[PDB]
Amino acid sequence: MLKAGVHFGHQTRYWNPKMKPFIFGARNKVHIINLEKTVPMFNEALAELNKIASRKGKILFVGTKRAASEAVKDAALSCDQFFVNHRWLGGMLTNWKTVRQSIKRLKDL
C-alpha cells in the first residue's frame, strides 16, 4: 500500500556500488529506487529530525546551490536553524575549539 512521493526514474551511471542496495532496477537504462529500502528510511528521517528539535538540538543546513543560498538562511521566527550558504572554513566542526577564535573575530564586528 506504500507509494513514492515524486520518483519514477532518476540518472544512469554516474555510479557507486554501495548504492546498488537502494536501486530496484532500470527503465530505459535510467535507474529506479526500491520503496522498502527508501520510504521507511525517509519516514524515520523526518521523525528523528523532529525528535532532535524537540530535544532542543542544534540544526545545521547546507544550501551551497544558488536557488537555496537564501532560503537556507531562515526557518521562520518560531524556529532556530544554523546555515552554510556559499563557503566553508577548514576544521570549523572538528577543530571548532580553535575556530571559536574565528567566530570571536566575527562577533567582534
Partner RNA sequence: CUGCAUGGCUGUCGUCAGCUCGUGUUGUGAAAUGUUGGGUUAAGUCCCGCAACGAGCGCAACCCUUAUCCUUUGUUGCCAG
Q: Tell me which of 17, 29, 90, 107 binds RNA, using CB under 7 A.
A: 90
**Local structure of residue 65 (DSSP, 8 states):** S
Tell whether residue 107 is a contact of RNA (CB under 7 A).
no
Q: What is the full DSSP assignment across 83-99? A: EESS---TTTTTTHHHH
State how far the Cα of 98 lies from the Cα of 18, in Å rounded to an integer.
Answer: 35
Q: Is the dihedral of CA 22, 28, 30, 32 positive or negative?
A: negative
Tell whether residue 62 is a contact of RNA (CB under 7 A).
no
Tell whether residue 97 is a contact of RNA (CB under 7 A).
yes
Residue 33 near residue 3, CB atoms below 8 Å: no
Question: Nearest approach, Cβ of 91 to RNA (angstroms)?
Answer: 4
Question: Nearest approach, Cβ of 71 to RNA (angstroms)?
Answer: 23
Tell whether residue 64 is a contact of RNA (CB under 7 A).
no
Stretch that binds RNA, among 10-18, 37-45, 57-65, 101-109 (CB under 7 A): 101-109
Tell whether residue 88 is a contact of RNA (CB under 7 A).
yes
State how far the Cα of 63 lies from the Cα of 65, in Å rounded to an integer.
Answer: 6
Q: Which residue ranges make up the site for RNA (CB under 7 A)? A: 87-91, 94-95, 97-99, 101-102, 105
